[model samples]
Target: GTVLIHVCCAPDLLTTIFHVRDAEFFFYNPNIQPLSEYEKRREAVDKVANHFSLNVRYGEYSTEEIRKWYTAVKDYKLGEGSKRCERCISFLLERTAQEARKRGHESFSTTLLASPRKNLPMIENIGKTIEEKYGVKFFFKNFRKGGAYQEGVRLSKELGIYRQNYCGCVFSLLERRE
Candidate 1:
């Protein structure tokens, strides 16, 4: 039951870890804006992974690599829950699937589903398409259901990890400013 679970942020992964087993965390979200913010999230991920004694496979993180998100998600006007969000999610999931396939993971999943703000059905559908495209199983779990997200909030505070306010992205940060 080898699985590669894509981690968007440490806070989301706090609850997801309870439901997933025999999995290695895949830290690969280029959507996060500003290198400093990205590093904060990455550091939090490190804390959570260390606390849980879990193995994590990190994706490439650098100015050059982060530039890919801008190209992937054009139309900066399109905010959260729009076509832009879908493209961003798809891009991230596809990257996750590619890594999982290369690493011989039987399936791939993401902690994005753990966020109530995310469109779950749309994300699941995207996973299905990736499954067909890559031949790697798309593991689906409604991690937001049954108070999982609530638990995640509590645990993240307990673990004393940094919690981000706005969703990842320069647009999201700008939207918050407005």
Candidate 2:
């Protein structure tokens, strides 16, 4: 009955862990750019895990691995929920599903659903597709549907979590600066 939830960063994980306290977290995001930024995000997740006393499994892949996946589709534009976004979601969620099966988890989910800015249908489709393909349950839930984003912001502020400005990855980092 345990689920493996994929975490993007600490702030998103803050509210997600609260909602799925019974599940274990699997840090499988290798798409984050700049190894230093990746380390910071990983440390943030570690802080949240320590505070909540939750179980977690890390993928521990380098930025190069992320780059390998990213560079293959760098030409795609980024913003307002494009096809590029769909592909990105598919890639990450598929990885999460694979890891979940490997760890014997019956289901999987992601903190990506916590973002109000993302296209929920596309994200859910990606989750569903992977679930059917892998023969495992994809615990699809819009963490931001019921004012969860607001609560997440509040909880993150109270917890003093490192709230990231950009949505992780080099493309977002560039967009943030531009």
Candidate 3:
């Protein structure tokens, strides 16, 4: 029941809140780039936290962290929604698992599962693999069912959160623009 959730962004967490319970939100996406966009997402997350009365922890935001992504994802050039995306998610999930262990959390999950645009099966598989590797529990749930996506859209609009257009990273941003 206790878990540290890897939140992708505000809309994701707000939409997924009803599906997962007893989670300490962790906003650790070095994947987000351009600094300003990262801050925008963080502000939205704060609003969601206030609305839900939840605890959220921010991750590292630095050019040095972006350096790691270039190294980690250099193999896949296809970018967003490809295996490259999977690799990025895995990187964050691995970090999430590590932090959860450090903080005495038995399990960890990612709000990426809350997004209909993201590949849920791949994300789920990756989470399970991380759980096995670290011997930490991965919270599993299909939050897309029963109007969850619509509800997320509704609530995000109601609150006027700045939902991100791309999946984060310079590559994803470039791809979105093109």
Tens digits of per-residue lDDT, candidate 1, 1-178, equal 6999999999899879878879988999888878789889999999999998999988988787777877877764467888888888888999999999999998999999898789998999999999999999999999977788888999999999898889999889988899
> What is the Cα-based TM-score of model 1?
0.96
Using lDDT, give the best candidate's number: 1
**Which stretches of candidate 3 lie above 4 Å from their native place?**
none
Clashing pairs in 2: none
RMSD of each: 1.1, 1.8, 1.2
Ten contiguous residues with the weakest lDDT in model 3: 140-149
lDDT of each: 0.89, 0.80, 0.87
In order of listing, the candidates' clash counts read 0, 0, 0
Arranged by lDDT with the best first, the candidates are 1, 3, 2
Q: How accurate is candidate 2 locally (lDDT)?
A: 0.80
User: Residue 16 in model 3: shift from native, Å?
Assistant: 0.8
Per residue, candidate 3 scores C-alpha lDDT tens digits across 1-178 of 5799999999888778878767898998888888888888999999999988998998887889878866788799685788888889999999899999998999999898888788888998999999999988998787767788788899999988888888888888788878
Residue-level lDDT of model 2, residues 1-178, one tens digit each, is: 9898988888888767546768888887777777787788888889888988978888867756777668655768556367777777787888889988998999999998887677778888889989999977989787875666778888788777777788776777778888
How many times do residue backbones clash in model 3?
0
